[PDB]
Amino acid sequence: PSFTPTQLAARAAYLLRGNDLGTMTTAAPLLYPHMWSWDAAFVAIGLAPLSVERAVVELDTLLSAQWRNGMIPHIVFANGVDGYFPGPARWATATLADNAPRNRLTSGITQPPVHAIAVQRILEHARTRGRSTRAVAEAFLDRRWGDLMRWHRWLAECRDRNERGRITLYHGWESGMDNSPRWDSAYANVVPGKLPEYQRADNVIITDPSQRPSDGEYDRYLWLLEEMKAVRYDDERLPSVMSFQVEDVFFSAIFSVACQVLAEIGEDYKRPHADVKDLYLWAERFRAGVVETTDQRTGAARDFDVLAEKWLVTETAAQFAPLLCGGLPHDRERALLKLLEGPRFCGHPDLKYGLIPSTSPVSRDFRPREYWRGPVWPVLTWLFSWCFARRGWAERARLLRQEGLRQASDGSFAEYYEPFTGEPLGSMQQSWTAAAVLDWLG
Amino acid sequence: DPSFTPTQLAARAAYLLRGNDLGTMTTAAPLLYPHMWSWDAAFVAIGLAPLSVERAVVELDTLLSAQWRNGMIPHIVFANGVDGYFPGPARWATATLADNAPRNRLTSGITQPPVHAIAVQRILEHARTRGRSTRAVAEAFLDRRWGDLMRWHRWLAECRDRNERGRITLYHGWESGMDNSPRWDSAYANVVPGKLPEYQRADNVIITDPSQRPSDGEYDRYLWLLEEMKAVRYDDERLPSVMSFQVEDVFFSAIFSVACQVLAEIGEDYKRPHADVKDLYLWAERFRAGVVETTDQRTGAARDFDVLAEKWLVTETAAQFAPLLCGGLPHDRERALLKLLEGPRFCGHPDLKYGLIPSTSPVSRDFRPREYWRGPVWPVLTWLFSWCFARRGWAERARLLRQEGLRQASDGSFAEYYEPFTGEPLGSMQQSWTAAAVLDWLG
Amino acid sequence: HDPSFTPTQLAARAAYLLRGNDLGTMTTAAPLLYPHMWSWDAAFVAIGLAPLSVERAVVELDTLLSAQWRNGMIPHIVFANGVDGYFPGPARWATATLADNAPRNRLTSGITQPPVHAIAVQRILEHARTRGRSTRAVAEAFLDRRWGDLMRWHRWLAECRDRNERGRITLYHGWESGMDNSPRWDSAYANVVPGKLPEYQRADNVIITDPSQRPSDGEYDRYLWLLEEMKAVRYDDERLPSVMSFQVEDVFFSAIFSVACQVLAEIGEDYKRPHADVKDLYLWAERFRAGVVETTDQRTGAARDFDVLAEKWLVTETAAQFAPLLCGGLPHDRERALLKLLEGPRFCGHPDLKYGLIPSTSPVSRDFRPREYWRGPVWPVLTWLFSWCFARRGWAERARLLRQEGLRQASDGSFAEYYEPFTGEPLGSMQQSWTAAAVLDWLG
Amino acid sequence: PSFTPTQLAARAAYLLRGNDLGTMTTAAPLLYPHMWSWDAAFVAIGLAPLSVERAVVELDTLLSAQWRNGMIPHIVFANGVDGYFPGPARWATATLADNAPRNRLTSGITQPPVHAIAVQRILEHARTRGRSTRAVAEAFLDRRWGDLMRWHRWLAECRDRNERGRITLYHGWESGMDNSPRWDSAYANVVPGKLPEYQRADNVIITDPSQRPSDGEYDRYLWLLEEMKAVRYDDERLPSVMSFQVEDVFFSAIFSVACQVLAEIGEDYKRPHADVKDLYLWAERFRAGVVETTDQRTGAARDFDVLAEKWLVTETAAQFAPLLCGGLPHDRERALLKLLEGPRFCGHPDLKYGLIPSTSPVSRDFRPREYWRGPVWPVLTWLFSWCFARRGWAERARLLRQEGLRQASDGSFAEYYEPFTGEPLGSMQQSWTAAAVLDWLG
C-alpha cells in the first residue's frame, strides 16, 4: 500500500520532472496545464533538492512574466496549450492591459507572495552544495532582487492603498482558495450583467461535481473578469468599479512573512539598505494588520469585506493567519493554538490524519469533498509546517510534517484529500503536493 | 560532506531517469549515448519499475518493437533525427542492407547480452506488490511479449551457438558490452582492416579526456568489423566465413544461462507453454555447463575463447567471475573463485576506495585506472553481481556490494564508471543504468 | 493517531529491551514468564546482540555451551541461579542428582531444543567481519574455544536422537520442538496416560492469566508426566526409547539440523577446522535433508511428522509442513507446489490475516485457535527463521516480503511473543527477547 | 566503519541501559561512576524515546537529592562506588552541610539548570504515546513541580543576590566546563593554603595527560573545596570567604531558557499563576543580564569576575550564550551569528566537522585535546541545536544535528572529539553523548 520514504521521494521527483514543459512546470498534468504563480514557488522548493539550477529557472520564468507595474500574475500560460478555461483569449490581457508582459501570455489577477520562501529554500540548499551552486543562486539574486522588490512594493503600494496592512483582493482566485466560505458573502453581492457565453473545462477533467465549484460560482468568477477587462486592468480604476473587494487576512500574513524572509536575504547578501528597510516596514505593517482583525477571545483572524464594510466571520484555515506571522499577545496566541488543535480543527474526532481541514468539520459551510470547503490540502500542511518551525515551534511543525507524509504515502500526490476517509480528491499528480513531500524529505 | 541522503539520492536518480526519457525510450546518457541501448534499456526498466510499472513496460515494448525478424535484439535503437553519436544509422546501413532489420525503427547490426529477463522479473515483482490493475499491466505485457522474448533467446541459442557448445559467439567486441576490455586484445590484434572508409569520432568530442575512452586504433578496428558485416548484409549464415573477429564470451554466456532460468520460472508462474519452459531449462543447463568447461582448475576463473585462433583467452578481468552468476562449479572451485573475488587482485586490493569489483584487476599489466573497461569500477556490474549473488543465496555478500555501491553512488554524479583508487567519476555523468541501480537498491 | 515507531525508534527500543533482560552473562527469554535462559532463545539473543556487541553475543553462547551435558546434549533451559517464578524448575527436573551427564556447575533441564545455534554463529561471524581486526579476533577465539563443543552437540543429535539413521530427530517431549501445544503433537499426546503424578502448581498462567493464550491443565499434566518418565530412568539415553510414552520424529527440528549442519560445515571450511568434522557435517546435512524430503506429500510437498510409537505419519496443517523449504532437497515440481501452499489461502494468503505472515496453525484447519500459543498465532521468531532461510535459498523477494511484514507487525514496540493472526493483538509475554532479536537483526 | 542510523540508535540505547544502576544512570561507566546533574537531564532526554516511565525515574532520583534550600547538587554519589575523586569523604557534605538530604550523599555545589528542558522533552514524547503514558508524565509534574520551582527560586534568589540577572558560581566545576579558559584569570587568584594530600583517580582512567586538567588545576579545585567546607556550605557565608566568585553567562542563559520553558509547561498544565509569573520574571531578568555582558559590536557574551570586578574576555563556545536565550538587538545578533560561523569557530578550515569547538581554534588558549580547551563536545552540539530550533532557526539547527550525527557515526559515544582529526576523546560510552544521538533520532 504505502511507499517507503525513498520510494516516495523518488516517485515525487519523477512526478515533478514529468510536469516540466522545459522552462516551466505545470501545476498538474491536465487540470492546470500551465504555470500558476504560487504553485511555481512551491515547484521551486521541490526542485531545489534535485537541481538548484532548475529551481532557479522556475523562478526566472515566472518573473519574466511580471507585469510592468510589478504584479506577478497568477497564471503564465503555456504557448499553444488548450485544456484550461479561462484561457488567454478570455483574459485578453495581451490586448487590454498596458502592463502585461510583451512576450508571455498571462492572466490579469495576482496570487499570494510565497515566492520569497522559495528563494530562501533555494539559498539554503545551494549553500549545502558546491561553490558553483552557490554562484548560481547568488547570480539569481543579482538578477532578480529588483524584480522581487517590485513585486512586494506593488502589493504594498497598490493593494494596500490606505496603509491598513491588509492586502485587497479583486477576485477570489487571487486568494488561492477559490470557493472558500470566506468569500461567500462577498460573492452574494456580485451581480453579473451580460455575461458572454462560455463552457467550463475544469469539470471535464474532474467530472465529480461534488469536488469542484458550482456553475453559479463560475458565473461570478467570470463576471469579475468582465469588470476588470472593461477598465483594461487599470489599477487606478479597479476600486471604483469592481463588485468584489475584500481584504484577505491569509494573503496578508503570508505577505508579512515574505517581507521578513526577503529582508533577511537582503541582509545576508548585501542588497541595498533602503530595500531591507522597506521590507522590514512592510513586514511589521502587515503583521499589525493581521492582528487588528483578530477575535478578542480566540485570536482567530477575520477577513474584511471592503464594499460591505464588515468583518467576514467564517471557520476556515485562514483564521490561523496570525500563527504564520506572529504578533498576537501571548495569551491570545495560546487561545488560537488551542482552536487549531481542538475538536473544531486538528482534533476533530473523525479525521483520518492530524491535519488542518480547509474548513472546520463543525461549520455549517463544511463540505468533505468540495475543494476549499473542507478537504485537507498538502500545500497548506507544508506552509503551516514551515511557518511553525520558523516560529520555533519545533515539535508542532514536526507533527504536521509527520502526518503530512503519512497522508502522502499512497503516492497519488493528490491536490487535496477527503478529511475523514483520506480518499485522494482533485487532480492526481499535483506538483505542489509532490514539492511538499520532496521538501520534507529532500 | 558532498553526500546525499538515501531519499535525496533516490529522488535525484528518478529525476535523472525521467530527464533522459525521450517519450517512449530512455537514452543511456544525456549526450554520450543519446539513443536506446539494448542492455541499458533492461536496466532502465529495472530503475523505472518502482516509479511506474506502466512506463517500465513501455521501455521493454519499445526495444522489442525493434527486434529483428530472426529474433535478434540489436544493441542500439536510434532515436529519430538525433545526431551526436557515431556510428550512426548511416554507418550501419542496416535500414538498406539487413533483410531482417525492422521497417519502422533504425537499429544497429549487432546484439548485446540478454539481461532482459531479469528486468521482466523485477517488473513482475514490483507489480505484485502494487495491486490488481498494476499486476494486470505486467501480465498483459507477458501475454504480448512472451513470444518475442522466446525468439530472442532462441536466436542466441540457435544462431550464436550453432555447435551447441553452450557459449555465445560474438562478432564484435561491442556485443560484449565491455568494448575495450583486455579480454579482446589478442582477438583484435588479428583484425587487419582493409580500405576503411574515413570517419570522425563523436564519443571523444563529448568525453575529451583521452585517458577515459578507447584509442583511435581500437575504433579503426571497431568500424572495420562493421565493414565486414556490411559487405555481407548482416546475414547470420555468412558471418562465420568472413568475420575477422569471432570469440566466445563467457560472461554473456553466463548471463544467458541466468536469463533462461529466470524466464523459465516466469513461464512456470504465468502458465506460458510447457515446451517453452523446457527449452529455457535446456539452454540454462547447457550454457551453465559451457561456462564451467572454460574454467581454471585452481582458481575457478572463467576464460573467453578465440574461435579463429582456437585459443582460450586468459586475462584478469571481472568476466572471470561469470561462473559465480550462473553456478555449476564444483563446491571447492567456487570457494577458490570467491577467494579470488575478495582477495587483493580484486575487491580486497588495498588501494581501492570502495569494496567493489574493478573491471580489470589492478595487479594486471593491462590495468588502466581511467580507461573504460580496463580497470574502473562500473555501477552496472556492481548491480548485476549483487543481484545474481542474492539469487545464489549469498545474502551477506550481495548486501556488501549493495552497501558499497550506494556509498560510491552518494556523490550524485551517477557516473558511468569510477576511478578505483580515488573515486573520481568518469565517463558520462547522468548515466541511466547507474541511476537505475540506485533506484533498484532503494526502490 | 499513529502509534507506530520509526525504524530507529524500534531499533533503540529493541536494544533497550535486550539489555534489560540481561542478567549479566545470560539473557532471559522474557522478563517474567521465562526468567531463565532458553537454548534456542539464546541463539536468537546472540543474533540480536551481534549488531550491538560481538563480545556480549559470544558470551551468551559461551554461557549456554557451559551448560552442555557431558554427552553433547544442549539442554533447553539453563536455570538462573536462585530465581523462581517458572515451573517446572530445577527442583522438579532434579537433573543435578539424576542425570550422570548434567554439567557439574550449571542447573539445567533434561531435554533438548532445536539446533539453531550454528545460524547464530554465522550471524556473529558476519558482523565481526564488518567491524574490524579486534572484533574478528574475538569471534575467531570463540570458534577455537567452542568448535569441538559445537561438533559434540551436532554428533549427539545425529547419533543419539537418530539412532536408526533415518535423517530425522526423535523427541521425547513436545517441549523439545519449541512448539509446545502445536496440533502436530495432539495424537501422540493422546496416548500419554499419566500415572501417579506428584502434585504441582503452574506458574506460567499466573503471569499470563488469560487461559485462551496458554496450554490447558490437561496438557500440562501430560507434560509433567513425561518428566516423571525420563526422571525414572535417570535421563539415560540408552533407556529412554523403551520407557518413554512420547516418541516422535520432528520434521521441522530435522530440517533445522540439516540447515545448521550445512552452515556449520561452511564455517568449518572458511576457518580451516578439521577436515574430518566438515565431511561429517556435510554427511549429516545431506542425511537430514533427505530424511525431511522422505516425509513429504508427493502432491503438495508438505512435510509430515512421525509417531514412532503409533508407527504413523502425523498429517497436520501447521507451519511445520514447510520444513523442506528451509533445507532444500525437494524435486522442482514438489517445491513449487509447496510454495503455492505457503502463499495460498490456507496460510499467508488467507483473506483475514492482518499481515502477510505465516500463522503457526492454518486458519482453515479445525485445530486453529487464533490466540492459543502454537495453535494459530503469528510468531515473529518463525518469521525471522523463514525469512533468513528463504534468503539463503536465494529467494530474495520472498524473504524481503516476510521481513517487511514482520517489521510492520513489530512496529507497535510491544515485542510480543506472538500476535493474533487477524487483529494483530499482542499476545504471550511482552518484551520477548527473540522478538527483539528478530527486529534488531532485520535492522542492525 | 560507520554505523547506519538504526544501528547507532540501537547501540545508543544499549549503552544507556548498560550504564543504568537501577534508579540512576552513571554519566560514564568508569570515569564518572555516579550521577551528575546535567548529565541526568540529558539521560532523561535520551530515555524519553525508550521509556517515559524510566525517564521520570531518572529525574525523581535526582530531585530526591535536592537540598533543603532548593539547590540541586551536581553529583549524587552511587552507594558503594569508590573509583572517583573527590568523593563523599572529601566533600564531607553529609556532615557539614545542614541542607544536604538524608540518605543520599551528594556534592556540595550545583550545575546548570537544563532540567526544565528534559521535562519538556519528556512531556512531548508522552503526548505522542497515549493516555497512560501522558498520565505518568503529568503525575511527575504534580509530584515535582514544587521541587522544580524551588530549584529555580534558589538560583534566582541565592545565586543572584544582587538581582543582576546572572548566576554566581563559587566553583569552576559548576559551569560544567571545568578547565575552560573562561576561568583561568579567576583561578590564578586562588592561592591554596594547607591543602590536605590527595590522589587523583580521574587520570588513572584517562591516562593521556593531554586530555584532562593538570595537577595544578586540580589543586585549585580541591582548595575551593576546603573553603566552603570550612564554612559548612552555608549560602549566607560563601560570599565572605570564597576566593572564586564568577558570574557565568552561559549558565545564566540556560536558566533564562529553562525558566521560559518551565513557564510554558506551567501554563499548559495549569500550575499556580504565581509560579508562572515568577518564572517569566526570571526568564526576562536573566535574558537581560546575559545581554548586558555582550560586546556592542560582535554580541559575544563575557563572563564576569566578581572579586576582580572585571569582564572576562575569552574566545570559548560560551560567548554564544545569547543565541540560546534571545534578547539581543537584531544587528548584534546577526554579528554574533557571523562570529559563530566564519573562521574562528564552526567555519575554521581545519575542522573535520561543521561543529562548535569548546574553544576557538584561533585562541592562544586552544588545545585540540585538552578537555574544554578546544575539543568538540556532543553535549553542546545538542544544546545549541535544540535552542536554535527553539529560536526558529530550522536550518541552522538541522546542520548541527546532521554534523553531530556524522561525527557520532563511529559509535564510540565519546565525551568529546578532537576538532581536526575527529579522534574520540575522554571517556568512551559517555551517557549524554548517547542521549544526544537518541533524541536526534528517537
Author numbering:
A (entry chain B), D (entry chain D): 5 to 446
B (entry chain A): 4 to 446
C (entry chain C): 3 to 446
Sentences from the paper on this structure:
A glucosylglycerate hydrolase (GgH) identified in M. hassiacum and found to be highly conserved among rapidly growing mycobacteria is likely to be responsible for the rapid mobilization of GG accumulated during nitrogen starvation by hydrolysing it to glucose and glycerate. The MhGgH monomer displays an (α/α)6-barrel domain typical of glycoside hydrolase family 63 (GH63), to which MhGgH belongs. While the active site of GH63 members acting on larger substrates is located in an open, solvent-accessible cleft, those of MhGgH and of MgH from T. thermophilus are covered by a cap domain (subdivided into A′- and B′-regions) with constrained access through a narrow negatively charged tunnel. The crystallographic structure of MhGgH revealed a homotetrameric architecture, which is compatible with the oligomeric organization of the enzyme in solution as assessed by SAXS.
Despite crystallizing in the same conditions, selenomethionine-substituted MhGgH produced monoclinic crystals (space group P21) that were used for structure solution by multi-wavelength anomalous diffraction at the K absorption edge of selenium. The total surface area of each monomer is ∼17 300 Å2, of which ∼1600 Å2 is buried in intermonomer contacts. The largest interface area (∼900 Å2) occurs between molecules A and C (interface A:C) and molecules B and D, and involves 14 (A:C) or 12 (B:D) hydrogen bonds. With approximately half of the size (∼480 Å), the interface between dimers A:B and C:D is stabilized by four salt bridges. The smallest interface occurs between molecules A and D (and molecules B and C), with a buried surface of ∼260 Å2 and a single hydrogen bond. The C-terminus of each MhGgH monomer is in the close vicinity of the A:C (or B:D) interface and the addition of the C-terminal affinity tag is likely to disrupt dimer–dimer association and impact the quaternary organization of the enzyme, which is in line with the observed lower maximum temperature of activity and decreased stability of the MhGgH-His6 variant.
